[PDB]
Amino acid sequence: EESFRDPAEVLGTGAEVDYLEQFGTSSFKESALRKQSLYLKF
Amino acid sequence: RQWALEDFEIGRPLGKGKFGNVYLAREKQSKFILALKVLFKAQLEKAGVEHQLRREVEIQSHLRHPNILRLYGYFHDATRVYLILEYAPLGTVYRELQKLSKFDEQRTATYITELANALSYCHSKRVIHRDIKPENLLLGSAGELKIANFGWSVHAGTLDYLPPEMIEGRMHDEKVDLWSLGVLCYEFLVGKPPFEANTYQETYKRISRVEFTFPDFVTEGARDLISRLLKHNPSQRPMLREVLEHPWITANSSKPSN
Ligand SMILES: Nc1ncnc2c1ncn2[C@@H]1O[C@H](COP(=O)(O)OP(=O)(O)O)[C@@H](O)[C@H]1O
């Protein structure tokens, strides 16, 4: 029930708080999941 | 073969402090669950405690006892020190005492039995460990005591657990641990330590003169043990084997059952 991650994803996340802030991330990822990439014709 | 950060995956934080962080963690190959204490080199150097740290981890790494938190190993990278520790899942005795206010005689005798056992083992290795305050005692999964302030922490009182010979600035030895055990036994049963006072000056007085009183609910067996432990003269305090033989301890302690 307890989750574990690679140390690179955990250590120093408190320190890199400013770099972990990116406007529009969750909205963009959601709409990325829902959009299709059409086959490259011609 | 050396320990490496690559050997581990890291879970939720268990505590944070100026010196670093403690995490729930897991060794990748075995999936063995443990705790990883992570210390900032910058803060250690800034505090000048690098020598002291090495000494403490060296000491803990050789203690192997069911009621002492194991240190399985240690390593470092460019900016951090990593201590691989036994995980104790049920929190501190401090918190349990908050929740319950006071412990009954069976819980107290049982805790004191586990501590005397751990301390006897420590003394057999010429190790003195006076600080056994409730906040330094973790609980294992079976509710057994784990002395948890070996190694290094991420972080009118405190004097509360100091013996007369220490506050008077005299030579002290392993018998300071017997005084601690008395203070702790009292605090377990009463809910506060026996020499508590408002000022530094007045707490010094009470300890130095060994002045304290029992609530009327404290039984004769308990009073007898605590009074033997809180003797001004260290050589008049019992040996730990004598604590483990005390009638009040033997009658009220328990081992696991259904
Ligand atoms: N091995 C461990 N297992 C579970 N909890 C731990 C462990 N080590 C430390 N903790 C908890 O993490 C916090 C920080 O502990 P520590 O670095 O020893 O400083 P403290 O003096 O506050 O205990 C405390 O709440 C402590 O109880």
Fold and architecture overview:
The complex is a heterodimer of chains A (42) and B (258). Chain A contains 1 helix and no strands. Chain A is mainly alpha-helical and 42 residues long. Chain B has 10 helices and 7 strands. The longest helix of chain B is centred in the middle third of the chain and has 20 residues, at 105-124. Chain B is α+β, with helices and mostly antiparallel strands and 258 residues long. The relative contact order of chain B is 0.13. Chain B has helices spanning 41-47, 50-60, 93-100, 105-124, 164-167, 176-190, 200-208, 220-229, 240-245, 247-252; strands at 8-17, 20-27, 33-40, 71-76, 80-85, 137-139, 145-147. In chain B, helix 4 (105-124) runs antiparallel to helix 6 and helix 6 (176-190) runs antiparallel to helix 8. Chain B has a 5-stranded antiparallel β-sheet with strand order 1-2-3-5-4. In chain B, strands 6-7 form a two-stranded antiparallel ribbon. Chain B folds into 2 domains: 1-91, Phosphorylase Kinase, domain 1, CATH 3.30.200.20; 92-252, Transferase(Phosphotransferase) domain 1 (Transferase(Phosphotransferase), domain 1), CATH 1.10.510. The chains are: A mainly alpha (42), B alpha+beta (258). Chain A binds chain B through residues 2-7, 10-11, 14, and chain B through 5-6, 8-12, 16, 23-26, 33, 38, 80. Bound molecules: adenosine-5'-diphosphate. Residues 14-15, 22, 35, 69, 85-88, 92, 138, 148-149, 153-155 of chain B line the site of adenosine-5'-diphosphate.
Based on the model shown, name its key terms.
heterodimer; A: 42 residues; mainly alpha; 1 helix; 24% helix; elongated; B: 258 residues; alpha+beta; Phosphorylase Kinase, domain 1; Transferase(Phosphotransferase), domain 1; 2 domains; five-stranded antiparallel β-sheet; two-stranded antiparallel sheet; 10 helices; globular; binds adenosine-5'-diphosphate; ATP-binding (chain B); protein serine kinase activity (chain B); ubl conjugation (chain B); EC 2.7.11.1 (chain B)
